[PDB]
A paper describes a structure:
Neuronal calcium sensor-1 ([name]) is the primordial member of the neuronal calcium sensor family of EF-hand Ca2+-binding proteins. It interacts with both the G-protein-coupled receptor (GPCR) dopamine D2 receptor (D2R), regulating its internalization and surface expression, and the cognate kinases [name] and GRK2. Here, we report the determination of the crystal structures of [name] [name] in complex with peptides derived from D2R and [name], as well as the structures of [name] alone and in a C-terminal truncated form. Consequently, in the Ca2+-bound state, [name] folds in such a way that the two lobes are oriented to jointly present a large, solvent-exposed, concave hydrophobic crevice onto which peptide, proteins, and other hydrophobic molecules can dock and bind.
Determination of the crystal structure of the complex of Ca2+/[name] with the [name] peptide revealed a different mode of recognition compared with D2R. Only one molecule of the [name] peptide is bound, deep into the hydrophobic groove of [name]. The [name] peptide binds as a two-turn α-helix involving residues Ser-5–Ala-14, with the peptide aligned parallel with the N-C axis of [name]; electron density for the remainder of the peptide was not observed. The protein-peptide interface is formed by 29 residues from the protein and 8 hydrophobic residues from [name] peptide, with total buried surface areas of 711 Å2 for [name] and 921 Å2 for the peptide. The electron densities for Gln-54–Gly-59 and part of the EF3/EF4 linker region are missing. The main protein-peptide contacts are formed by residues Leu-6, Val-9, Val-10, Ala-14, Phe-15, Ile-16, and Ala-17 of [name] peptide. These residues fit into the hydrophobic crevice, with side-chain hydrophobic contacts formed between them and the exposed highly conserved hydrophobic residues of [name] from both the N-lobe, C-lobe, and C-terminal helix 10. In contrast, the C-terminal region of [name] in the [name]·[name] peptide complex forms an α-helix that lies to one side of the hydrophobic crevice. The electron densities for Asn-134–Glu-137 of the EF3/EF4 linker region are missing, making the C-lobe site very solvent-exposed and allowing the [name] peptide to bind deep into the hydrophobic pocket. In both the [name]·[name] peptide and KChIP1·Kv4.3 complexes, hydrophobic side-chain interactions are found between the C-terminal region and the bound peptide, indicating that that region helps to stabilize the binding of the partner peptides.
Author numbering:
A (entry chain C): 6 to 17
B (entry chain B): 8 to 132, 139 to 184
Write the structure that this text describes.
């Protein structure tokens, strides 16, 4: 589920 | 999982049949009802980030997972999101994120929409980036090519590919 986190929040 | 369901999810994702079955087993262990709720979704983000408030961001993410917008995340929605984010092309991952950030689902991410997104991320988690507003200004300065205060999909995709740390982050 780490990939979900990265793809979701990357823009910060 | 039923065979026609199994076959359909395999055909729609970057997973094999066995991998889809293994994910289902994992999904049902963590969420016995098979119908993941807002709260359930929030725990995923409290891990990784246990020291902020992920409520706002977790909601935006729950809404893009909720493909049929019925208020629950069922397995087919879970596995399809997961397919994109773990095995998608860079373009595919950027499309999905564009969809996450385009809150009103027109074809544009406004500065305000991006502000809501970045602020939610900050609430969930360098001086130059120490406020959502500074981060957003930096984003629009790099990506808003026609300077209209909105990002199209193309602007977002190209702007994101221009920046090596974004490329690194979405490897
Ligand atoms: Ca749903
Ligand atoms: Ca919009
Ligand atoms: Ca623009």
């Amino acid at each position: 589920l780490e990939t979900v986190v990265a793809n979701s929040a990357f823009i910060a | 999982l039923k065979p026609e369901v199994v076959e359909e999810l395999t055909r729609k994702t970057y997973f094999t049949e066995k991998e889809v079955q293994q994910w289902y087993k994992g999904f049902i262990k963590d969420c016995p009802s098979g119908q993941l709720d807002a709260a359930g979704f929030q725990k995923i983000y409290k891990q990784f980030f246990p020291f902020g408030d992920p409520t706002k961001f977790a909601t935006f993410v729950f809404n893009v997972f909720d493909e049929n917008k019925d208020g629950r995340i069922e397995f087919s929605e879970f596995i399809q999101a997961l397919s994109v984010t773990s095995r998608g092309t860079l373009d595919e991952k950027l499309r999905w994120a564009f969809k996450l950030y385009d809150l009103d689902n027109d074809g544009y991410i406004t500065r305000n929409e991006m502000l809501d997104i970045v602020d939610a991320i900050y609430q969930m988690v360098p001086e130059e980036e120490n406020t959502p507003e500074k981060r957003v200004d930096r984003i629009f300065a790099m990506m808003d090519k026609n300077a209209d205060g909105k990002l199209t999909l193309q602007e977002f995709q190209e702007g994101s590919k221009a920046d090596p740390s974004i490329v690194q982050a979405l490897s």
